[PDB]
Write a protein that binds this ligand. Sequence first.
Ligand SMILES: Nc1ncnc2c1ncn2[C@H]1C[C@H](O)[C@@H](COP(=O)(O)OP(=O)(O)OP(=O)(O)O)O1
Ligand SMILES: [Mg+2]
Ligand code: NI
Ligand code: NI
Ligand code: NI
Length: 927
Amino acid sequence: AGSPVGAAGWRVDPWIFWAKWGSGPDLGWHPLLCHMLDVAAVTLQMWRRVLPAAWKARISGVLGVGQEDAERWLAFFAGGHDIGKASPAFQLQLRPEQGRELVARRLRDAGLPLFNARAPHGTISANVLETVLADVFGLSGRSARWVAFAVGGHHGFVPSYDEVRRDLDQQAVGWGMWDAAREVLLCRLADALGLPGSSRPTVESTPDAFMLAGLVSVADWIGSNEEYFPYAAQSALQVPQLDAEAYLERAMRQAERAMASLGWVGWRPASGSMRLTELFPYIRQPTTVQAAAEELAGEVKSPSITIIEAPMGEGKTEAAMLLADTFSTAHGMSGCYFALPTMATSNQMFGRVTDYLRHRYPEDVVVVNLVHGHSDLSALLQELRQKGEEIFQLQGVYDEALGDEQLGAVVAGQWFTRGKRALLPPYGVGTVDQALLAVLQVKHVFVRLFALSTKTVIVDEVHAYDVYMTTLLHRLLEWLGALSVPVVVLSATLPSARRRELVKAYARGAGWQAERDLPPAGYPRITYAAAEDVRGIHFAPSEASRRKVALRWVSAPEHEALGQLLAEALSQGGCAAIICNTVPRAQALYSALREVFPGLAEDGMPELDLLHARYPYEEREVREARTLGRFSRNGRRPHRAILVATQVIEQSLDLDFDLMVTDLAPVDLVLQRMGRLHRHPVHDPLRPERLRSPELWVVSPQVMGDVPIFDRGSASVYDEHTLLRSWLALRDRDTLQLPEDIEELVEQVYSDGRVPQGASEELRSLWERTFKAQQKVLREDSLQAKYRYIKGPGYNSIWGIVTASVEEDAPELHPALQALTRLAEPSVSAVCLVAGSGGPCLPDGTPVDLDTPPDAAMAERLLRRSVAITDARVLDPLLDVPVPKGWERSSLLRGYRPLVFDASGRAMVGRWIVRIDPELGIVVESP
Ligand SMILES: Nc1ncnc2c1ncn2[C@H]1C[C@H](O)[C@@H](COP(=O)(O)OP(=O)(O)OP(=O)(O)O)O1
Ligand SMILES: [Mg+2]
Ligand code: NI
Ligand code: NI
Ligand code: NI
């Protein structure tokens, strides 16, 4: 520091600097030191009221200090996140319309030099902390640099090394008097936290600092809510006179109230030492997999991965929740995230999770988990309808890459509105995609790693096709292993190579130097892996799982006779499902099937029904509720019904069907679809005699010679070569011998064996060609990994864990990078409206003002019309439609495109016609 500073300069007065500033009705402002005390207070309350004890113990172990020192120091860093706001570049950012000259004269009175240079405040925070944390606070240079970059990454991305130590203007950061000012602020915040003269923490572990950045981001978000953290200054004209400690106390109580509103407090484990029959009253005699799980439960270690492989319908989820209960009770990991399969809704799972949660936690589960632990939109809607202003609302989030403070407040505020919100609460149910996003190079990934770090992860239903086609779960397992996160993976069946690479990934993250191989065990089995311990527990399949399943084919010439086949099969009655690989095929087959089954069912709704994601959300709620009401284990089963549907039935849902028709798919997916066939024994006596023998109809592809010709939709959804392997594995079967044939088929298709089996040359050509295509895809993804995936845990530099496109912002996320990695289909969110005078209107029938943000009621009614279009034909033209100016400033409606149908229910989008059918849902069609 090259500028001498006199005592008059050291008088400074800390309170003059601002961190938050008002706009309209709020003429006041928030002093920077107040904001730092607020974020530190939120960190303290997190440590004392939210975080699981195992997390605090482990982080205290990494820090090398006791839990008290770890608490005050983490609070010090998190409060130190905005230290760079004390720079000329940020203080002069103020709007001229809102008293910028007043702040200018106020700084000038202190004697601070002024400069017009501009830099993001977080990079400045890294630039100052990397030196100040060492030269004053006595931390090692590595810990200082690590805390500096991590804390400086809080608005989206950790700064690149050049951003902090090369391109950064000195005039932007300031020096001399500014350094004395920041030194004063940091010393006062530290004294308020009681840092002297406690032993200095070691922060040299890269992954830990990385997730800690996510903790800091969440803390700043909590401090950004003006309802719980009102600005201390009542007007720009005057600087408040404050005692830092009393303000810290008030900030702590406010933090407690704010986090209490989010339902993070207070999940007391309330042990306890419960058995499986107690947690789940509905089960009398536990299934064999649950028995082996109950036996394993007494021997589990704090960080370990479990892989459960049992036939579908055997009740693996209760075993997973059992191990999770053992983790929360006996190992201090009181939190869990239930990672659902991508096509699954959270609804049915959430009730099971709630029913388990009643046995371990007080009735706060009613007042907390019901609205906060749910990922899907219905909970957000009920939270909107409920009094009062239940949704968390941010303001004054100064993300430089967005155009203004409130815009950044909206983008950050999406974390409390979008499905990713389910990640935040200690118990949450949601898609596996939210957890898989943690390894992508996207905004705020460290927030995801931080959320996952505090909970055991339970991956419900893993498919072999997914683990074969992508590395996402492997990388997530590496980072999960680094964070000492317990993991349970449910699966109907996996190839041995897949289990090997998964356990290898979690072990690689764990740092487990032991290289001993996984013990062999017959199917069904439970793999297990702790530090010093590794197990392969085989167990006898339940006798109910021993069934022969008929496998009939319907060839393309017979395909139009398929409805007549449904007539001859269901003539005696009985439920039946028909899975389709794509929405348009489902709509078409349904339209064809309407002629065959006109009749109403006993429940007063038609026996024929359709289900897919492409509906306005309320209609989706109706059809989903009707389906779950018909075909669940306890539902009012119709004497006869037919349900055409996509793969939304294929995953997670607890449905039962007397008969199953399905499109060709990779075999693990077909079996997963087949798990809904005769799933519940209680339904056995009442089944029609024609359907008493389980039977699985598969839709055959057109076959020129011996060469299959897959339909374009399935070809676009699934890898073509895998479909070829599956069709070859299934084409000669007459009967499936469960449960061994499950593992047999899956280990046949995904394993090394090439079986042309002496067929035609053209088929060999199709084989080699489709395989070359698949390998070209996998290779191309492997070569683009630097631009897509974050560095693994063993990477040494805290910077460069995420490189480009840093601070865009905010880069996709779901529409873009999600698609290149095939994590999910790219899509547009849309709001179905109707045309009329005065612009777009709701169907019933009130006008919408697109120019202003919606009120919560109107936002709810608008969200009820929402739909996630994913069709390639109209996706781009829909993106070209601007998001209306009032919506992008709303966290509830950012990224949503209005979709104005006419009275005919038609709308002109691109060359294509979009139409909103009462039965078919949204329908794309050529004009
Ligand atoms: N021990 C049990 N005995 C009898 N029924 C049980 C038992 N445990 C759970 N069930 C019920 C609850 C569910 O409604 C139904 C299916 O359980 P479930 O956990 O969904 O199996 P699963 O998850 O392994 O199937 P899948 O592999 O297809 O996802 O059986
Ligand atoms: Mg399951
Ligand atoms: Ni900030
Ligand atoms: Ni801040
Ligand atoms: Ni901020």
